[PDB]
């Protein structure tokens, strides 16, 4: 369970996530790592899926992010398709729905997704020789 390749597609969404940019991903989310460290790891889950999917639900159809040329739409759209994936992998690895986040910090989406990865990067490593 701990370690299932579901880490192995999280990492994935992440890598692609992180190589894009658009013109939200520099937009906010609540920065669940400006804790105190004080949560199992499947609170962490938990509470990044939670602000991920306020962030999509949120900027899904947001004027700013949509895009005026092709190009943008499309890199639009590719942000939001993996941000749901990347969502719905957390979550199946929460095995939790509720749990508030209570951080006043917010960073941009972009330096979110890249802690995330190096937290990712981390349980992998753990999980292998």
């Known amino acids: ?3 299932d390749i579901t880490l192995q597609e999280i990492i994935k969404d992440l890598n692609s996530l992180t190589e894009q940019k658009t ?3 520099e937009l906010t989310v609540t920065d669940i790592f400006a804790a105190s460290k004080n949560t199992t790891e499947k609170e962490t889950f938990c ?3 939670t602000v991920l ?3 999509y639900s949120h900027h ?3 004027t700013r992010c949509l895009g005026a040329t092709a190009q943008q739409f499309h890199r639009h759209k590719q942000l939001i398709r993996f941000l749901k994936a990347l969502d719905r992998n957390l979550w199946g690895l ?3 729905n509720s749990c508030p986040v ?3 910090n917010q960073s941009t989406l972009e330096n979110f997704l890249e802690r995330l ?3 990712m990067r981390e349980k992998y490593s753990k999980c292998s020789s």
């Open 1 to 3: 369970h701990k370690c």
């Open 23 to 25: 013109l939200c991903t």
């Open 47 to 49: 509470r990044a899926a």
């Open 53 to 55: 999917r306020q962030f």
């Open 60 to 62: 899904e159809k947001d």
């Open 94 to 96: 929460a095995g939790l």
């Open 102 to 104: 209570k951080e006043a």
């Open 117 to 119: 990865k190096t937290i």
